[PDB]
Design a protein around this ligand. Sequence first.
Ligand SMILES: C/C=C(/N=C/c1c(COP(=O)(O)O)cnc(C)c1O)C(=O)O
Ligand SMILES: C/C=C(/N=C/c1c(COP(=O)(O)O)cnc(C)c1O)C(=O)O
Ligand SMILES: C/C=C(/N=C/c1c(COP(=O)(O)O)cnc(C)c1O)C(=O)O
Ligand SMILES: C/C=C(/N=C/c1c(COP(=O)(O)O)cnc(C)c1O)C(=O)O
Lengths: 384, 387, 386, 387
Amino acid sequence: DITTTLLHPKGDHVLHSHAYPIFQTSTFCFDSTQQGADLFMGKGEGHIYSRLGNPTVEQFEEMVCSIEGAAGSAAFGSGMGAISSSTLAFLQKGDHLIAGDTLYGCTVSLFTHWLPRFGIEVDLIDTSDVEKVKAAWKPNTKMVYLESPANPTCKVSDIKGIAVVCHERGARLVVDATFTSPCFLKPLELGADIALHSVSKYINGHGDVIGGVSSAKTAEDIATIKFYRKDAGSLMAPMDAFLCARGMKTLPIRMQIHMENGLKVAKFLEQHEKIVKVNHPGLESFPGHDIAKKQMTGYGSTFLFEMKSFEAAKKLMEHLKVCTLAVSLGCVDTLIEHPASMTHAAVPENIMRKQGITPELVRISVGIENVDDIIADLKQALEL
Amino acid sequence: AQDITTTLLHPKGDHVLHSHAYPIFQTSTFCFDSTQQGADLFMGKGEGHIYSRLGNPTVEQFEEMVCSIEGAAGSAAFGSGMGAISSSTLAFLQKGDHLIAGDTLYGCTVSLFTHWLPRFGIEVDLIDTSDVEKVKAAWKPNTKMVYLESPANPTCKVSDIKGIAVVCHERGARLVVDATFTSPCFLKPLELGADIALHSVSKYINGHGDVIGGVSSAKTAEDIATIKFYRKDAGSLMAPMDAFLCARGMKTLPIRMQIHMENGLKVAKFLEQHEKIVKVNHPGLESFPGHDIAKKQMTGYGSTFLFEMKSFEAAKKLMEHLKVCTLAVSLGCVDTLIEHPASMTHAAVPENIMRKQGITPELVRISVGIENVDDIIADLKQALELW
Amino acid sequence: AQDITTTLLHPKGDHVLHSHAYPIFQTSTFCFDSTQQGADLFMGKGEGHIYSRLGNPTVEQFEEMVCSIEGAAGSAAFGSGMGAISSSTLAFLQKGDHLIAGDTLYGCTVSLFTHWLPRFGIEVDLIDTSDVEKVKAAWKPNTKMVYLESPANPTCKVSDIKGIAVVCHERGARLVVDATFTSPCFLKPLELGADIALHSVSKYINGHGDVIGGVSSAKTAEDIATIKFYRKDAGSLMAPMDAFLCARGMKTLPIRMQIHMENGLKVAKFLEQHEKIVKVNHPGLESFPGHDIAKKQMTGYGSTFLFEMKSFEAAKKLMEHLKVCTLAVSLGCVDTLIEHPASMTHAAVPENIMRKQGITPELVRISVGIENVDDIIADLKQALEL
Amino acid sequence: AQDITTTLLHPKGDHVLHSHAYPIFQTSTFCFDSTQQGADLFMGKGEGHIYSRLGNPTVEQFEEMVCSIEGAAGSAAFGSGMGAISSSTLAFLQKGDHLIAGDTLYGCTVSLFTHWLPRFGIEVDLIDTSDVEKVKAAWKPNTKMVYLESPANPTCKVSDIKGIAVVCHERGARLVVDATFTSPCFLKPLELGADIALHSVSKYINGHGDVIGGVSSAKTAEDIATIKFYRKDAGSLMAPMDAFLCARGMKTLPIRMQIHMENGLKVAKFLEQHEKIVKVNHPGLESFPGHDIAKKQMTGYGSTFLFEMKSFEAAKKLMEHLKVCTLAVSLGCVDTLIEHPASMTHAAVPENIMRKQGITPELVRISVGIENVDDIIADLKQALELW
Ligand SMILES: C/C=C(/N=C/c1c(COP(=O)(O)O)cnc(C)c1O)C(=O)O
Ligand SMILES: C/C=C(/N=C/c1c(COP(=O)(O)O)cnc(C)c1O)C(=O)O
Ligand SMILES: C/C=C(/N=C/c1c(COP(=O)(O)O)cnc(C)c1O)C(=O)O
Ligand SMILES: C/C=C(/N=C/c1c(COP(=O)(O)O)cnc(C)c1O)C(=O)O
């Protein structure tokens, strides 16, 4: 399994240190002018300046790279840094982007407010249907951007299918795989060109850092991403890379519990009288199931369910003793949130409708607490 | 008027659990009391926090410190100076807009303005901003922004910020000034007419060579809100631990800058009179073109400057035989740094731009630290006197 | 009743500024509202903080977490396991007192008991604590404390904590137990009758090999107050950053221990049936001397144990041709560690005490991590075939 | 002779992976090349590391900086000043030995010496060490150590270190000096004859009020080894992150101490001439007993000192109405702190020792920071002139 690989990453120890040191430094010394000049031309081994490359950050990069099966990986200050760099490194004025109609709030914001200002045409469309992608296609389409399962509805897209369309028609396929982690979803393995995550979520898993990572199938593309990063300036700080690498050491073990717990909570909720419906990709009733079952080796533990009214949703969210009312996901403890008024509050009403987000929906992120304790907490907030 | 040393040591805000040092909020998310209290914070209603990308208390304390020396309506911290530059430009500029920028800029700003902006349909001209008439001559009906570095990295070329600000204000353009080389102790672009002042905190502000970060300050509440809206989507964030270090570094900014200024001038004068040195580009020297603008618009000088040797081989012999100065890029550190712009910080700048910047293989850039100045001068002197 | 996994993920206490992760109070000192309020806090009156050596909120959060698994009146965090050991013993023992300690202990514990305590006028007898009668026989009118590790470092020798605690209760002596090797998931000494339970946090509790720290937990409020009073003067503090990392590490302690246990047992059994191996000392093996006491007193096992090679040359050959296991001291990390006690962790212990501990150039100690066991066995197997 | 400022900015030792800032070795253990190479390291042969309790690279960098200003054979870092004091005393003293210590000491040092040492069969007398004759009169055949704090916390009482060192040297006792209040910039006890100089690093050395730590330096390789042998068993360690912060703090130590010294003297003179102030105990004042000794044995003054108000009520009124000084214990921070010894730092000192120490409810201790001195003085003045 992946645990051994993550505990035994490639490369040398620094001064025989067992834990890899924190290179809390901005700059690096040169042995000579020639050696420094050589490093700026990409010749020889070594470092220059932490924005171009930091050993502690590179160590975390290598960890993600190996699990993704990439040619390379780039860490950023946030998921949004990885997202904006994995798109604006490639898209320019006159290009067209097709994006999933259902996305994290700030991704909607990026694609909807910023890209069109830079002359980039953007269409949000229902990517759970490959033919809708073929129809939205234009002669200037350079990229398709997917989340799958999507935030917050878990809507599934056919990554393999869309990848074939992209390869045939000369477009990059970019997949935000935050919700599932690289334990269970490896988009590069499905034909995607770029796979990215908010490391703030499962990969770090401890709710104490914000970070992003992007991984590219080709050496050229990862180099472009790092060239953009050098100029856009969204970096992972060395301390944060130390914590992300450290949190990643328990990643495969944490996901196993996340997946089993998310599944059990979802079923509990699904057969409860108070719950209209549960959107979990691992349920036989959920419309994305057959594709998700086939394209993923497991499931994350964040999903959405429907209450009968706003009052009922508020009442449930406000009477949990173990679950915490908070945005974010993928933390070791259970989080709960209300998309309409929180993570997706700023989404234009028209895109809101297309996503199917209403005041009755509540989103949960199941931690690794004992399941029966979290089922019990939900139970008393539902019935009592 | 309370001195700046005092202001930086006593920033406004409540203590947290009576802690003397401001804690490190190494957290991603924040808890809500109720769905209403959370919904409201997302609406901008009420006091509190949601998520560190949107606002982190440790970072916010550092932003308050900066906002207070700058005299701004607000400040935003970033993962790097480049994060601050991207967000202070691309937050306002859009396809069809025109930017006038100084022709002498930090190499990666050159790359940003030259490779990325045009790909986004932004028109860019690099102009000699030391001449206001040339800025006027480059102006177009669609000009939206002027971006300046003064003194410029690495040649110390001085631009008339005041004079340029008048033209921006008459014609509806934002004036954005990168004041990294001088620090906000000595250069306050918002007091000179700029709309935005920004810094690589990586340099003087932090001062200890152990953090990369950026900060941008705006004259107007609206502009700082727009910048932070961009930051939220573009994602260049200062990490809580890095904010804690920069705020800590900043506690000694005024006294460090006083020593930097005085050391830098003494080193420049020593070099200026040395047989081996052809020319010294320090804006505090009377021989420097633009000394008169610099002395009127600033209140001191940073300690990073450029000088000319007789040859490239002479520059290398100097650079490689120092025992106190360290050969490395960056600047504004407590210890003295030295580098060769032509093959290092500015090695990727396109040939025509490098020629217009005046960067040759004979040039050496020094960033003088806070060591005893006699030790620094004796180190340079022994290297210049080598067999 | 809430499960321990849930308990560790939901520590008691107020959030600071609504922060989800508990903040790192990297501060030395704290402000007072008024002279009266400062003065009151110095007298233990009212709620609040003064100075991090007396108490730091980040450190106290970690302390609360540990106090909960142990079932203690209170816990104290220190700069190291040795700080915990020194403070848990010398806070109580004074000139003329007598201490009985297990004869097989961590090397620096031996150094502490054998070099420093007798200089402070404290009499120390190291005796075989796996036999309760040898404890009774070694007793004196001035015996104030019994100190144990079980299973012991590095031989895993098991003592009957519960039987020894009865003797201590009867005779007016504190029982102090170093439970580092087992973690508080599996061994809770305060539940067996011990007065104090301590750990090198550097090991399983943190579990990520990147911090050094100690913790001590006491059955009574008066004893933990005494320990903290010693700590105020001796000055072995846990740093706020390290407390943040230990609390964070501890968030996964129960799942990590479960894997450590099952992994360790599988590796012990593989070695027990390999022809190159004379014996395996794992308290969870049916063939191990104190197995019955250990099954009864503990609810699982740590994954650090000792095995015997045929010669020094074979032991060396094994340790130096492993590709996954790392040659290094320490234990309880996420990754597998391996060490040669005779020349490393216990190199400094006097011949005298080494004879009685049964440590020889042929013993190798492994600390099995949470890697896939099949990878650890494959590494071991490959080295044993050269 | 290279200045101390330069020396601290340019410490000996190789760079790690060419990193300009020294990395933080947040690790517990270290890998061995072979069983022989590890065996060797346990015997003390070869270069390298084993385990962070025995030695950590980031902590050793901080130790070398301290060793370099002290002039020592080696230094050892601890989790606190109290860890440095414990390990500097109990590593040497054993049952039957006798210690002479100053009668005016930091509260917890009093607790250590009067509560813990006697329990270990060590005999202790607290003596007025400002009188060398009183030290000689308290000497016994078994005296093994004299421990001094000078100027003492909180009364600034001055001991003659040099004169007392002569007696220690003649009679085979170690002289241990706690030099926390003055910093190693201004007081170097190893140059005056001490065997051991120690500090709470939590104060001036780190300077930023965000770390608790201790350091002890010895004149002899054998003594520093014994101190470290004790440390490995007593377990008071400086954490790698804390060592990183202390080393970074120490980079500005000389300039910070220069401002502390000047500010502190100016505040003392202001208070000394103020109608509301009865007496000022600053060892830099001509009116202070022991000024002549302090001026001869130190090359400057710390900025923490004590003054006497007309009453407890007057003291409380002053302490509670300041806006730039912060009411809190500790000292040597960049910002100004103020404290009431009688009910705070020394509230736990036995009545007899407190009468000997001279501590009354009328005394206020101020630790003067690096704020502009006019701002600090104006803040004191407005509080002293309250309705
Ligand atoms: C508060 C944030 C939430 N999500 C964020 C997120 C990001 C953005 O990642 P940074 O937050 O920039 O690291 C990217 N991609 C996905 C699928 C996401 O869900 C949340 O929903 O609760
Ligand atoms: C290695 C870096 C050098 N400069 C950087 C720099 C930045 C960029 O700031 P970050 O490096 O992104 O924090 C922005 N603005 C100015 C005037 C700069 O000098 C250097 O010159 O040596
Ligand atoms: C290198 C250290 C090893 N052990 C340490 C240890 C300590 C001491 O704990 P600090 O090292 O002070 O945290 C206390 N108690 C026990 C049963 C221990 O094994 C080791 O054996 O490999
Ligand atoms: C709050 C602390 C104060 N003092 C401390 C101190 C220590 C003890 O050092 P740690 O505090 O253990 O680093 C040792 N030696 C001296 C002369 C001291 O002043 C104080 O006075 O206000």
